[PDB]
RNA sequence: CAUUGGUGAGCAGCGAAGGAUUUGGUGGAUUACUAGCUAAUAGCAAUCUAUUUCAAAGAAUUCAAACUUGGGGGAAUGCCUUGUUGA
C-alpha cells in the first residue's frame, strides 16, 4: 500500500561539480547538488542514489572496476558508497574545501587535493565487511604554497602531478624510493595552472594555465633535466580557461573556456581539430570516456549537460535541467512521461525511465503557471502569466490555439473538460472564471460570483461538474451544461487554496490556510470529513528569521493536493520540507517524507547553530561575494526585495525549499513532487517488502515448488499469491503451460485478480515474452471482463498499465510487420523495369 | 561461533574501565589513551572528542597502557603491542607464560615486568628507529631483594637507570649492563603507588595507610612524609604550572590537593568517582596546565581547572578551589533496555540498572547526553510528594517511543521496576515529561505501548487492565478488562483500527479501537512473555513459555508460523525492518535468525555471554544487542544489506539456489512455438528503423572551425586482409546451410554496424549475397526468437536494396527466397490477431 | 524585464498582438530534442495543409 | 576574518579591519574604543587619513569615509574596487589603487578627484608611498614596480623587480632604499636614488608575503 | 445581582530532615568522531642554527586589459585618439 522510497530525481541533469564516465563508457555519473544521478545511455535507464549530502557536491570519483564511488561535498564531508549495492559504506570528514578526488588507475589507493596538501589514502576493499575506520592513510605532501586546483595520476600508478594557484605544477612519486626519480617542480606560467598531464609514454608533460597557454616540457639537454621545449598559446582575448582535459592514448586536449567555447587540439603540435560553442555561459567541466570517443561537458549557469561525439560532430545528448523554477507538474496518462511547466517560460516533456527531456516548447513569454493534459495523451494545455492559455498538440508539436481574455488579466489555474470542448481558467486579478470553447476559439462565458481570487479549479469527470475554490473561503460547484446553468456554494472555515476531485466525481477534497484538508460530498453539499494536518508538518527556520519555526506560520498548510486513483489516499505538499500521505476513510496519515536535508537551501533545519550566530548577526548572512577572484562571479545583478521572478542571481537570498506540485502516477504505485531541486519520484518495491495475504502454516516456497512438480497450477499460483513473493509468482507464471492458461485464468479468485493484473503489467513492460503475456491478458480479460467493468476503480491503475504495454511495445511490432508485408507485396507483384 | 549475516562493528557507550589511563603529548597538545575491555580509545584533551579507537580487539584484556609521542604501547596478556593511530605497527611477544603486569618506556629501552618479578628489557635496533624491537636482557628480582613489583619508573637525568619500586623498597637497576646499583632502606608499610616528581632525584611513594613519602634517590633519605589517615592512596600527581601543589587521589573516591610550600591542604574533592568501582584509579595534572584529568572505574573520565586567584597582592595564599570542566561518561552497571530513537539510526535510548536513561549517539560519540530526571512544576497547584533527598527513579523494564509528535508533547512512555505507574519522557528536551500514568487496579505497569499518531498511550497492568491515556494532556480515557492475569504485550495498528493484547493467561485478544468492541479471543497453550508488532505487514510475534515464537497475522486472526528450536527461555527478539526475519536472543547464550517465509532457522551465533536485548535498526543497516555483563551496546552490521544471503537450515548441522537466494532469472524462451523479442533494450528496433533522422537532429546548428593542416588518417594514427568477417561468415553459412552463427553476430552488432553491412551487401551479379541473406532471415524467423530484430533487418534490406530486387524481380532465386519469406511471415500474423483483440476489449472495459 | 522582476512578476499583461508566422514541413523527430529517444513520427503539416 | 593592522601617524591609535565586516578604531594604549562598525561587505584595508578623527575603509566595491564615531560621511562613487589605500599626509591626498588597474588621487580637504591614472598592467598587487618623496611605487603582476606621480599620466619610472608577480614592497623613511618581495620566492633590496639594485636574495624557502622597514633600518619580512 | 477587574485576610485539599519566581557565569551538544607544528616521502615536539647555501628550471599577446559609469546638456584647462611641425 504505502511503502515508498526515493527512486528518481527527474528534471535536473547537472548542477555543480565533476562529471564522470563509467569505465566502459556506457554510464554517465553527474552531480545534482547532494545526490548523484547515473545515466546508463545504452539501455536507456537512469537512477539516482537515495543518500544525500548536507551541502552541494564539489567532487565525484568512481573506481576503475566500478565498485566504489566517493562523493565529496563542499567543505570536506566525503561519503564512500558501494556502487553495485547502492549503499553507503563510510563517511569521512576532510576539513578543507576539497578540490579534487581521483582513484589510481590500479585501484588500490586514491589521491585527494584538499588545501595546499596532497593527501594519499588507501582504498577499503569491497569484498570485506564494514569497519569503524576503513580509510588507512598513505602519505601527506605539503610542497605547494596556495590551494591545489588539479591532480593527475600517471598511467602506471607510481607518479602523481598536481597543479596549484602557486602558478606551478609539481611531480610527487608514490614511493619513497622513487622520490629521487621524481621530486620536481615546474614554473613559468602567468596566471594559474589549470592542468598538468603526462604523455602516453611519460617523457613529455603538457601544462595548461588559466592565462591561456600550454607548455610542452621535455627531458632534454640544452647533467640535463626538464626544459620547456614549446610554448603554445590560445589567442582568446576575453575568454579564460575554465576546465581542461587530456586523453593521452589518442593525444586529445579538450579545453573549455568561460565564453562558452570548447576547443579540441591534438597536442604534441597544437593543431585546432575543432572549435565549438556549448552555449553563452561559462563551461564548467570536461571529461572524456576511456576509449576517447565521447566528451562530456557541463555548465552550471542554467545547469546543462552535453555529451558530444567528436569524430562525426554529433551531440549524443544536449540536455538542460532546472533549479528553483518549476511551477507545475503533470503525468502523461501513462507512466511514460512527465510534463513540467517552468518559470523560464518553458514546457518540457521528460521521460521517466531514462531521465531526459524529449521535447521543449517555448512560446509563452513569462512564467507558465499550470499545465494539464486532456482526457487523452496527445494534447495538453498550459496557462501562464502573460495573460494567455494555449493548447498544444503532442503529435505535430504546435500551439493550434491561444485563448486570451479581453482585459488582459494573468491566469493562475486552468482546468480542461473531459469531453475536450471547454477550457476554463481562473486568475487572481479578476476573480471571475473565464471559459473558452476549444474547437472554435471564442470565449463562452465568464462565471462570476467569487468574492476574491480563485485559487483552484477542477472538473469532476464521471459527471462533469466544475468545482472552483477561492479565497472567498468558499467552494463553489457550477453545473454549466444542460440548459440549467446553476450554482451552489459551500463555505469553509478559511480561505481555500488547493483542490482535488475524486476519481468517481462524487467528492471534493479542499485544502485550507488553517491546515485542514476537508472532504465534501457534491450531491448534497454536506461535509464528509476532514484531516487536520498542521502538527505533522516540518517547518524550517530561515537564516534570516527573527522568529522561531514553532511560531512561524509561512509553512503550516499544504498548497497542493492529489487524490489517488483508487480514491483512498491523498498526497499533500506545500511550502515546507515535508510531503504527507494520508488515508481518507480513516483520516489518519500513512507516511511523511522529508524532501531535502540540504543545508544550502533555507527552510530545511528547525534549529540553527548558535556558533554561527554572532552578536553582529549571523555568520551566514555576510557577503562572501567580494572575496571572489572573478569580476563576473563578484558583481551583483540583484534587485531589492524581489522574489519569484527572474534568475537565481536577481534575488540576494538563499533559495528556499518548497514543493510546488504533486501528483500520483496513473499506472504504477508512485508519486511525483515538483520541488525546488527538481522532480522527486517515489515508488514501491513489492520485490523487497514481505507483505503476505491470508497465510497459513502450510503455505511455503517449498510447498509451492512441490505443487509445481506435482502439476497443480491453480494451487501453485494461489499459494504464490498468498506468499506474495515476486520471484515465486514469476516462477509459477512462467512454469504453467499454454493449454491450461484459460482454465487457470477462469478459476483464479476475484481477490487475486488485481494482483495478477499488476504483475502482468509490470513484467510485460519489461519482459521479452510478448506472446505469453498477450495470451495471459486475453485469457484474463475474457474470463473476468464484467467484474472489471463493474469495479472500474479497483482496476484503474492496473488496466492502465496493461493498455500502456499493448500500445507501447506490441503495436510497434505490428506496425513493422505490416509494413514489411505490404512492401513485399508491392515488390513481388508489380511490373519490373524496362 | 561465527555468523553468516552479522559482523561486529563496535561496542558503543564506554569511556573507561578502571585500568589507569595514559597521557600523551603531541607538540603542545595532549591526548588520553583509556582502556575499554580489549580495545583502547584515544581522546583529545582540549575537547574530549573521540579521536581514535583500536581497530582490532586483543586476544585478551589489556593490563597496562603507556603513550609516547605518536606510539601507544598496550600490554595485554603475554605480549606488548605497539600501535600508531590505532593500527598495530609492531608486536612484542615475551618469552614466558606468566602475564605482563607493568610497563615503562624510556630512551631506547622498553621495560616490561611480568608478574613473577622479572623485568624484560628490549632495545631499539637502530638508534634512529621508532620503537624497541629486539630482546636485550632479562633482569630479575628475587625474594631476598624485594617483594612483588609495584611499579616501574624512570627518573630524568639518569643514564641507563630504571627505578623499580616494590612493595618493600625502591631499587635502581642499570639496564645496559644489567647490574643493581642501590637498595633503599625497607619501608615499614606496603607501597602502592609511585610517581616521579618534577624536581630532580625525588619520587613520591603512596602507601596503603595514609602516607605519601617524598623520597630522594641521590641520597636515599625520606625527605617528607604526608599523612592521609584512614585511607588507601591510589594515584599521585604533581603540579608543573608554577605553583607547587600535589594531588593525592584515594581509593575511597576522594581527591585531595596539597600545597607543599606552606605544608597545607588546599582542598579536597569529595566523592568524584564511586568508591564501589575502585575509587579514583588515575589522576593526572596535564603538563604545565592547571587541569587535572581524573578517571574512575565507573565508566567516567573528568577534568577540572584551577581558576586563578581573586586577590591581587597575596596570590598563592588565597587559592580558589578547583571547579568542574569537561567530562565524558556512560553506564556504570550493564544496560537493561535499549531502543532505537529515530529512523535515521542516529540515536539510541539506553536505560540501565544504575537507574539512568542515556541517549547515546551512533554517529558521533560526543553527542550523547544523559536524559535529565528533573520534574516539572505541577499544573494543579499542590506540592509533589517525595523525599527531600533527591534520588533516581527505579530501573526501567519497558520503553515506548514515537516520533510523530516530537517537540509538541511527550513521546516516550517508560515502565519502571516495582512501581504502579509509568513516566512520560521528552526526547526533544531530553527531560522527563510532566505526566505520569497510573494503572488503577493496584497493579504494576507490566507493559506499555504508544499509538502511531502520537496521541495515545496504552498501559497494561499486572491485573489485566488496559488504561488508555491521552498524551497531550495526560488524561485517562478508557480501560479494557479482558485479561485477569498480567498483560505482557499491547500494540495498535498503524491505521488506529485494530489493537492486540497478549497476557499470561495464554490469551491473545484482538480489539477494535475506532469502535470499542472485541473482535476475537485466541487462546494458545503456554503463557505469553513478549509481543512484537510489525505494522507494515500486520504480523506480530509472541514469545511463549513452551519455548517457541508464534507468528500471528493480525487481520485473518490465526497462527501462521510457529518457530521451534530454542532450548531455554527466550530473552528478547525483534523483526526485520521489512518483515522477513525474526532475530531472537535466548538464555542458552544463542542468537538465532529465523526466516519468516520459509520458516526455518537460517543463522545461529553462540555468544560467550547471555544476550538480554536485541533490536534491529529502523533503517536496514544495524543490529544492536546488549548482554548480561558489559556496560556497552554491541553493534553488528548487515552483510545481507551489502550482499545476498542464502536461506537454508543450519542449526542441526552446526549445533534449488533459485529459491535459496530468492532470485529468479527468467526463461529465454518458454515454448518453441511462442514468439519472443530480443534480450536487450526495447529501443534498438526503433533506432535501427530511424537511424538517419536521429543523427540529423543530433548534428549542431553551424559548422565547426578546423585548421588546414590535419593528418588525413587521424583515427588510424591514434597511437598506443582479403575478406570481411561478416561476409566470410555468411559465405560459410551458405556453404553449410546453417546461418546460426550469422544470426548470433547480427544480434551482436551495434546500430551503425548493422546498417553499414546491410547497405554493403553485393547486389550486381546473380545475387548470391542477397539470396543468402534472405535465407538467413528465414532461418531466424523459423527459429522464433528476436522477432523484432529479424523483421527490422528485412525492412532495412527492403529500404536499401528494394530497387535492385524490384528490377530483378521474377528471377528464380530471389523469387524462391521471397516465397519462403512470405510463408513464414504468413505463419506469424497471429500476433496482430492477439494485439487487436486485447486492445479492443481493454478499451471497451475501461471506458464503457 | 527589470521592472517585472522588481515588481515580483505580478503585473498586467501585454494588450495583444498578431503576426503571420511561417512553418516548414519537417519530421517531428528532427523537431524535438537531442537525445537517444523520440515520441512522435508524423510530419509537421496536415494533409489539408499540404 | 583575517585582520589587518594600521597605526596612526602619531602612533597612538590602532585601526583594525577584518575580512568580513569588523572595523575597529581604538586607542590601544588607554584601552578605549573610538568607533566599531560591523560592516557586512568584505572589507580589504583602511587608513586613518589625517587624524584619529577620520578614516577611510575599502569595501566590497566603494571606498567609504567615516567620522571618529562611525558616522559614515561619504561614499566614493569614483573609487571602484580598491584593495590598497594610502594617504599622502602633507598633500592631504587619499590614494587608492585597485583591481581595475587604476590609481586615483582624491583630495580630501576640498572633496575633489585630483587625478585618475591608468596603470596599463592590470590589477595592482602591491603599493607603497615613498614618504620623503611622496611618490607612489605600485607593483604590478608582471614583476614591474612603477613610480607614479599625479601630474604625469605616465609612470615616472618602471623597474623590473622580479619574475612573475610582485608580492609586497616597502620604502625606508629616508627615501633611499626599497625592499620588494615577489612570488618567485625572491627579495630585492633596491636603491632608489640613481635606481641601482643593491642585493638580491634569491631563494626564500616560501614566497614573502609582506615587507616593512622601520625608522632604524630594520627590515621585517613575513 | 455580577464582575471573565485589582489589592489583602483565612480555610478545605496536596504535602518525607522545606517551597516558589527571577537571574549572572562556565561546560557539553546544535552536520557524521582519522591526533600538534614546519621549510613536510621526513623532522621537531627541551631548537633550528656554526650545511642553509650551490646546481638546475623559470621572461608572448613587443602595452590586450575599468567587461566595474544614475538621466540629460556641455567640457576653458586636463585626459584619450588622429593627423602636423621641429629635433
XYZ file of N, CA and C in Angstrom, chain A residues 650-776:
381
model
N 19.113 37.307 -9.342
C 18.436 38.578 -9.125
C 17.872 38.717 -7.728
N 17.880 37.662 -6.929
C 17.497 37.781 -5.536
C 18.667 37.387 -4.645
N 18.929 38.219 -3.645
C 20.076 38.053 -2.769
C 19.661 37.268 -1.532
N 19.139 36.073 -1.773
C 18.705 35.237 -0.670
C 18.867 33.787 -1.066
N 18.927 32.943 -0.058
C 19.201 31.543 -0.260
C 17.931 30.833 -0.726
N 17.996 30.093 -1.834
C 16.779 29.526 -2.424
C 16.096 28.531 -1.515
N 14.875 28.875 -1.125
C 14.128 28.136 -0.128
C 13.663 26.797 -0.670
N 13.301 25.912 0.239
C 12.719 24.632 -0.117
C 11.218 24.832 -0.198
N 10.586 24.144 -1.136
C 9.150 24.162 -1.312
C 8.826 23.027 -2.248
N 7.585 22.583 -2.222
C 7.102 21.605 -3.176
C 5.991 22.286 -3.943
N 6.211 22.497 -5.233
C 5.276 23.323 -5.978
C 4.094 22.507 -6.459
N 4.298 21.219 -6.709
C 3.169 20.426 -7.168
C 3.373 18.967 -6.817
N 2.281 18.208 -6.754
C 2.331 16.771 -6.514
C 1.279 16.099 -7.372
N 1.610 14.916 -7.886
C 0.601 14.031 -8.450
C 0.956 12.584 -8.181
N -0.071 11.744 -8.208
C 0.067 10.298 -8.197
C 0.222 9.803 -9.620
N 1.001 8.757 -9.801
C 1.190 8.236 -11.144
C -0.034 7.446 -11.573
N -0.430 7.520 -12.838
C -1.635 6.814 -13.268
C -1.465 5.322 -13.422
N -0.242 4.803 -13.526
C -0.056 3.392 -13.830
C 0.623 2.594 -12.727
N 1.656 3.121 -12.082
C 2.333 2.364 -11.039
C 2.076 3.045 -9.705
N 2.377 2.346 -8.618
C 2.215 2.941 -7.303
C 3.311 3.932 -6.978
N 3.374 5.047 -7.695
C 4.390 6.056 -7.480
C 3.740 7.416 -7.329
N 4.509 8.377 -6.839
C 4.058 9.754 -6.961
C 5.243 10.670 -7.203
N 4.980 11.741 -7.935
C 5.980 12.736 -8.257
C 5.654 14.031 -7.545
N 6.700 14.749 -7.171
C 6.564 16.017 -6.469
C 7.540 16.998 -7.091
N 7.012 18.028 -7.732
C 7.819 19.086 -8.315
C 8.226 20.069 -7.230
N 9.521 20.061 -6.899
C 10.103 20.833 -5.815
C 11.291 21.655 -6.290
N 11.911 22.414 -5.381
C 12.960 23.362 -5.759
C 14.205 22.709 -6.338
N 14.447 21.433 -6.086
C 15.610 20.779 -6.650
C 15.264 19.865 -7.805
N 14.008 19.845 -8.249
C 13.668 19.020 -9.389
C 12.323 18.346 -9.299
N 12.279 17.056 -9.614
C 11.038 16.291 -9.637
C 11.303 15.006 -8.874
N 10.927 14.970 -7.609
C 11.234 13.821 -6.785
C 10.210 12.741 -7.049
N 10.669 11.549 -7.418
C 9.770 10.472 -7.811
C 9.938 9.316 -6.843
N 8.855 8.980 -6.135
C 8.830 7.983 -5.077
C 8.038 6.775 -5.530
N 8.586 5.578 -5.323
C 7.968 4.373 -5.853
C 8.221 3.188 -4.937
N 7.419 2.138 -5.118
C 7.386 0.992 -4.219
C 7.971 -0.260 -4.864
N 8.476 -1.151 -4.008
C 9.028 -2.448 -4.397
C 8.319 -3.570 -3.639
N 7.323 -4.155 -4.311
C 6.770 -5.440 -3.910
C 7.817 -6.545 -3.932
N 8.940 -6.319 -4.615
C 10.066 -7.232 -4.537
C 10.644 -7.266 -3.134
N 10.892 -6.100 -2.541
C 11.646 -6.121 -1.294
C 10.737 -6.303 -0.087
N 9.524 -5.761 -0.100
C 8.734 -5.893 1.115
C 8.151 -7.298 1.231
N 8.043 -7.786 2.470
C 7.295 -9.008 2.778
C 5.945 -8.608 3.341
N 4.908 -8.716 2.524
C 3.546 -8.373 2.919
C 2.619 -9.454 2.389
N 2.484 -10.553 3.105
C 1.686 -11.663 2.597
C 0.203 -11.380 2.687
N -0.617 -12.372 2.380
C -2.053 -12.149 2.298
C -2.721 -13.491 2.534
N -3.350 -13.651 3.699
C -4.041 -14.881 4.090
C -3.096 -16.083 4.060
N -2.085 -16.037 4.922
C -1.128 -17.126 5.027
C -1.714 -18.295 5.807
N -0.891 -19.325 5.972
C -1.162 -20.445 6.858
C 0.144 -21.196 7.064
N 0.085 -22.229 7.903
C 1.290 -22.961 8.258
C 1.795 -23.781 7.079
N 0.920 -24.112 6.131
C 1.315 -24.978 5.025
C 1.909 -24.207 3.855
N 1.539 -22.943 3.686
C 1.957 -22.171 2.522
C 3.430 -21.819 2.674
N 4.254 -22.311 1.759
C 5.705 -22.252 1.838
C 6.233 -22.222 0.411
N 7.400 -21.612 0.178
C 8.044 -21.781 -1.133
C 8.337 -23.227 -1.483
N 8.695 -24.046 -0.497
C 8.937 -25.454 -0.774
C 7.651 -26.169 -1.152
N 6.546 -25.837 -0.488
C 5.273 -26.438 -0.858
C 4.824 -25.971 -2.233
N 5.119 -24.719 -2.587
C 4.733 -24.222 -3.903
C 5.508 -24.918 -5.012
N 6.811 -25.114 -4.817
C 7.581 -25.849 -5.810
C 7.164 -27.317 -5.841
N 6.724 -27.864 -4.703
C 6.164 -29.214 -4.697
C 4.892 -29.290 -5.530
N 4.038 -28.273 -5.427
C 2.814 -28.243 -6.220
C 3.116 -28.115 -7.705
N 4.139 -27.342 -8.059
C 4.518 -27.258 -9.466
C 5.063 -28.581 -9.985
N 5.900 -29.258 -9.205
C 6.411 -30.547 -9.652
C 5.353 -31.640 -9.625
N 4.240 -31.427 -8.928
C 3.121 -32.357 -8.965
C 1.990 -31.877 -9.859
N 2.209 -30.795 -10.611
C 1.305 -30.335 -11.673
C -0.069 -29.946 -11.135
N -0.090 -28.952 -10.252
C -1.321 -28.344 -9.749
C -1.163 -26.835 -9.885
N -1.480 -26.321 -11.068
C -1.064 -24.971 -11.426
C -1.903 -23.905 -10.744
N -3.210 -24.134 -10.622
C -4.057 -23.191 -9.903
C -3.634 -23.077 -8.445
N -3.325 -24.209 -7.814
C -2.895 -24.180 -6.424
C -1.540 -23.521 -6.279
N -0.629 -23.777 -7.214
C 0.688 -23.165 -7.123
C 0.601 -21.657 -7.277
N -0.233 -21.190 -8.203
C -0.394 -19.755 -8.399
C -1.053 -19.099 -7.191
N -2.019 -19.777 -6.569
C -2.703 -19.177 -5.429
C -1.797 -19.157 -4.201
N -0.991 -20.204 -4.013
C -0.012 -20.189 -2.932
C 1.037 -19.110 -3.148
N 1.468 -18.907 -4.394
C 2.445 -17.860 -4.664
C 1.855 -16.478 -4.460
N 0.554 -16.318 -4.677
C -0.070 -15.037 -4.377
C -0.172 -14.803 -2.882
N -0.523 -15.839 -2.123
C -0.659 -15.671 -0.680
C 0.689 -15.412 -0.021
N 1.757 -16.010 -0.549
C 3.097 -15.643 -0.104
C 3.501 -14.272 -0.618
N 2.934 -13.856 -1.750
C 3.132 -12.533 -2.344
C 4.590 -12.283 -2.723
N 5.341 -13.360 -2.910
C 6.741 -13.264 -3.283
C 6.834 -13.113 -4.789
N 7.587 -12.108 -5.230
C 7.616 -11.768 -6.645
C 8.326 -12.835 -7.462
N 9.420 -13.387 -6.938
C 10.098 -14.450 -7.665
C 9.252 -15.710 -7.717
N 8.429 -15.955 -6.700
C 7.554 -17.118 -6.753
C 6.445 -16.941 -7.774
N 5.823 -15.757 -7.817
C 4.807 -15.508 -8.836
C 5.414 -15.626 -10.221
N 6.623 -15.097 -10.406
C 7.271 -15.172 -11.710
C 7.610 -16.608 -12.077
N 8.051 -17.400 -11.097
C 8.404 -18.791 -11.351
C 7.193 -19.599 -11.786
N 6.086 -19.491 -11.053
C 4.931 -20.291 -11.444
C 4.273 -19.720 -12.698
N 4.322 -18.396 -12.881
C 3.766 -17.754 -14.064
C 4.468 -18.207 -15.327
N 5.773 -18.385 -15.283
C 6.427 -18.951 -16.444
C 6.421 -20.466 -16.434
N 5.989 -21.087 -15.346
C 6.002 -22.539 -15.304
C 4.715 -23.184 -15.786
N 3.594 -22.469 -15.825
C 2.395 -23.156 -16.309
C 2.380 -23.139 -17.835
N 1.898 -24.190 -18.491
C 1.983 -24.266 -19.949
C 0.802 -23.587 -20.628
N 0.787 -23.699 -21.958
C -0.156 -22.939 -22.769
C -1.561 -23.507 -22.653
N -1.691 -24.832 -22.660
C -3.007 -25.447 -22.776
C -3.842 -25.343 -21.508
N -3.297 -24.809 -20.417
C -4.041 -24.692 -19.172
C -4.202 -23.248 -18.715
N -3.702 -22.290 -19.490
C -3.904 -20.859 -19.263
C -5.375 -20.460 -19.182
N -6.276 -20.835 -20.109
C -7.655 -20.346 -19.958
C -8.375 -20.952 -18.773
N -8.103 -22.216 -18.457
C -8.691 -22.842 -17.281
C -8.233 -22.151 -16.004
N -6.923 -21.909 -15.889
C -6.372 -21.257 -14.706
C -6.904 -19.838 -14.572
N -6.951 -19.097 -15.680
C -7.399 -17.713 -15.630
C -8.897 -17.611 -15.405
N -9.650 -18.658 -15.725
C -11.049 -18.691 -15.325
C -11.174 -18.914 -13.831
N -10.517 -19.951 -13.323
C -10.704 -20.371 -11.945
C -9.820 -19.619 -10.954
N -9.196 -18.518 -11.369
C -8.425 -17.679 -10.450
C -9.417 -16.930 -9.564
N -9.078 -16.618 -8.319
C -10.025 -15.906 -7.464
C -10.086 -14.406 -7.712
N -11.281 -13.871 -7.465
C -11.550 -12.455 -7.645
C -10.759 -11.584 -6.686
N -10.198 -12.159 -5.627
C -9.400 -11.364 -4.710
C -7.994 -11.184 -5.255
N -7.479 -12.184 -5.961
C -6.159 -12.109 -6.562
C -6.216 -11.658 -8.004
N -7.378 -11.241 -8.487
C -7.403 -10.582 -9.793
C -6.537 -9.326 -9.881
N -6.656 -8.312 -9.007
C -5.833 -7.115 -9.230
C -4.355 -7.368 -9.049
N -3.977 -8.350 -8.235
C -2.563 -8.645 -8.071
C -1.969 -9.224 -9.345
N -2.682 -10.142 -9.999
C -2.136 -10.705 -11.227
C -2.170 -9.669 -12.338
N -3.117 -8.733 -12.295
C -3.109 -7.684 -13.308
C -1.912 -6.750 -13.144
N -1.608 -6.347 -11.907
C -0.428 -5.518 -11.660
C 0.853 -6.234 -12.068
N 0.956 -7.524 -11.738
C 2.162 -8.268 -12.073
C 2.348 -8.383 -13.577
N 1.277 -8.686 -14.311
C 1.389 -8.810 -15.760
C 1.779 -7.478 -16.379
N 1.240 -6.372 -15.860
C 1.574 -5.072 -16.428
C 3.040 -4.711 -16.273
N 3.583 -4.906 -15.067
C 4.987 -4.561 -14.830
C 5.939 -5.508 -15.560
N 5.699 -6.815 -15.435
C 6.502 -7.799 -16.141
C 6.453 -7.606 -17.650
N 5.296 -7.247 -18.195
C 5.156 -7.129 -19.634
C 5.846 -5.890 -20.171
N 5.803 -4.773 -19.435
C 6.582 -3.630 -19.907
C 8.071 -3.885 -19.766
N 8.502 -4.810 -18.901
C 9.897 -5.260 -19.007
C 9.966 -6.781 -19.024
N 9.710 -7.356 -20.195
C 9.926 -8.770 -20.466
C 9.932 -8.962 -21.969
N 10.452 -10.105 -22.396
C 10.577 -10.410 -23.809
C 9.603 -11.469 -24.287
N 8.680 -11.923 -23.444
C 7.718 -12.942 -23.852
C 6.406 -12.258 -24.207
N 6.405 -11.623 -25.376
C 5.241 -10.856 -25.798
C 4.070 -11.785 -26.094
N 4.354 -12.968 -26.632
C 3.289 -13.909 -26.942
C 2.662 -14.471 -25.682
N 3.484 -14.833 -24.700
C 2.953 -15.387 -23.461
C 2.157 -14.350 -22.691
N 2.657 -13.116 -22.634
C 1.920 -12.072 -21.938
C 0.605 -11.764 -22.630
N 0.584 -11.755 -23.958
C -0.673 -11.456 -24.621
C -1.677 -12.589 -24.470
N -1.219 -13.843 -24.454
C -2.137 -14.953 -24.211
C -2.752 -14.830 -22.828
N -1.929 -14.481 -21.838
C -2.426 -14.315 -20.478
C -3.435 -13.181 -20.381
